Amino acid sequence: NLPTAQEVQGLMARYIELVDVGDIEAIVQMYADDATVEDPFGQPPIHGREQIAAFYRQGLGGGKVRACLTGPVRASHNGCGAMPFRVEMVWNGQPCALDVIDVMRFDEHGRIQTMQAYWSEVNLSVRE
Amino acid sequence: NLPTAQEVQGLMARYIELVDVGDIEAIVQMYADDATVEDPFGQPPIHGREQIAAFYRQGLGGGKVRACLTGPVRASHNGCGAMPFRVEMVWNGQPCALDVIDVMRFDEHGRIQTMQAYWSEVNLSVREP
Ligand SMILES: C[C@H](CCC(=O)O)[C@H]1CC[C@H]2[C@@H]3CC[C@@H]4C[C@H](O)CC[C@]4(C)[C@H]3C[C@H](O)[C@]12C
Numbered sequence A: 001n002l003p004t005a006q007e008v009q010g011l012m013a014r015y016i017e018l019v020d021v022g023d024i025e026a027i028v029q030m031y032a033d034d035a036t037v038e039d040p041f042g043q044p045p046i047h048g049r050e051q052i053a054a055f056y057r058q059g060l061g062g063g064k065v066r067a068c069l070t071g072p073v074r075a076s077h078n079g080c081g082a083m084p085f086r087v088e089m090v091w092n093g094q095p096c097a098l099d100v101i102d103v104m105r106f107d108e109h110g111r112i113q114t115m116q117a118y119w120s121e122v123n124l125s126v127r128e
Numbered sequence B: 001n002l003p004t005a006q007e008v009q010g011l012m013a014r015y016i017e018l019v020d021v022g023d024i025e026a027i028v029q030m031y032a033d034d035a036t037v038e039d040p041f042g043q044p045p046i047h048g049r050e051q052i053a054a055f056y057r058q059g060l061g062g063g064k065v066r067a068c069l070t071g072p073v074r075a076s077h078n079g080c081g082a083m084p085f086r087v088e089m090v091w092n093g094q095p096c097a098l099d100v101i102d103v104m105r106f107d108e109h110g111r112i113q114t115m116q117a118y119w120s121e122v123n124l125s126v127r128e129p
């Protein structure tokens, strides 16, 4: 079952909700066993659930992180989608914010096969 | 490739400005000779200046296309970026709107080598928006 455009919208919105609450195990389950993540895009990809779990545990395990969609999820008819969102975090007690756009490709099992996050320091604020 | 993150933000913002004013020659000039456009993503990619020019001529200029960035351009360090924007146009005199996200990769000369637009009917409104 390759997700329809409508299903892609639901899956990606769910992902943001999982990041928002910080349920690492639930996030890792959304990925295919051999999925790849390029975050940020430009950096070498991480591969497989073990590396992806470590990635999320590192990024979300520490301080509290909040994430919210800032616009609708754009979905295609070939199981892919793109969405704009903002992440709010903390660095040594100081609030920070980042604007990101994630591009995802799902497989015929409704699992994320690949994820690419677009952002750089031009989208970051470490004093807000 | 060559454009820095800050430059990618400017180039992509300029692209929206040109689409908004409907300057087809200017838009086509932003593309590399071997560039490809996938719009909407999922459809067969078009390639080459002639096909790309035809694409824009067909989509723009008459009843009246306006485009506006709806959020910050997300830029990477490898000459790539992504941006959210809204397009307002007309269909047989009726106002419509479409929310889109374009992902672009620039070459070592500051030109668009690949453009991919994400959107489908779920992002469409043929009833005024
Ligand atoms: C894990 C989420 C979501 C992944 C995504 O969907 O893009 C991401 C979103 C923003 C990410 C943070 C951005 C700022 C930091 C960049 C560092 O180089 C690694 C630590 C931080 C704190 C990152 C940790 C983690 O990677 C976060 C919180």
Ligand SMILES: C[C@H](CCC(=O)O)[C@H]1CC[C@H]2[C@@H]3CC[C@@H]4C[C@H](O)CC[C@]4(C)[C@H]3C[C@H](O)[C@]12C
Residues within 6 Å of the ligand: B019, B039, B055, B056, B058, B059, B060, B065, B087, B089, B098, B100, B102, B117
């Ligand atoms: C040419 C611009 C910009 C290209 C991009 O940056 O994505 C795009 C943005 C939205 C595009 C329109 C979306 C609705 C229609 C889809 C049809 O299947 C072809 C005609 C229309 C009217 C498209 C024409 C043209 O392709 C437009 C106006």
